[PDB]
Amino acid sequence: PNDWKTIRTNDFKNRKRKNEPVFCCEDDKGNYYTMAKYCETFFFDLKEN
């Protein structure tokens, strides 16, 4: 995909437990892309003291 925001989960590394999502993909050349990230980080409770 051209947009990183449009990348969605396509598979699971451990299909038994429905965990560890993986987005398998391929490009024009002989390259295979495996992603093991599906959650970002949310910062909260900012401290000014």
Q: Which residues bind RNA (CB under 7 A)?
A: 17, 19-21, 36-41
Q: Which is nearer to RNA, 18 or 47 (CB)?
A: 18
What does the block give as tokens for 2? 């051209």
Contact 22, 15 (CB under 8 A): no
Taking the complex as a whole, the smallest distance from the CB of residue 20 to RNA amounts, in Å, to 5
Taking the complex as a whole, the smallest distance from the CB of residue 35 to RNA amounts, in Å, to 9
Tell me how far apart the alpha carbons of residues 16 and 31 are, in angstroms, rounded to a whole number. Answer: 27
Q: Which is nearer to RNA, 11 or 20 (CB)?
A: 20
**DSSP state letter for 33:** E
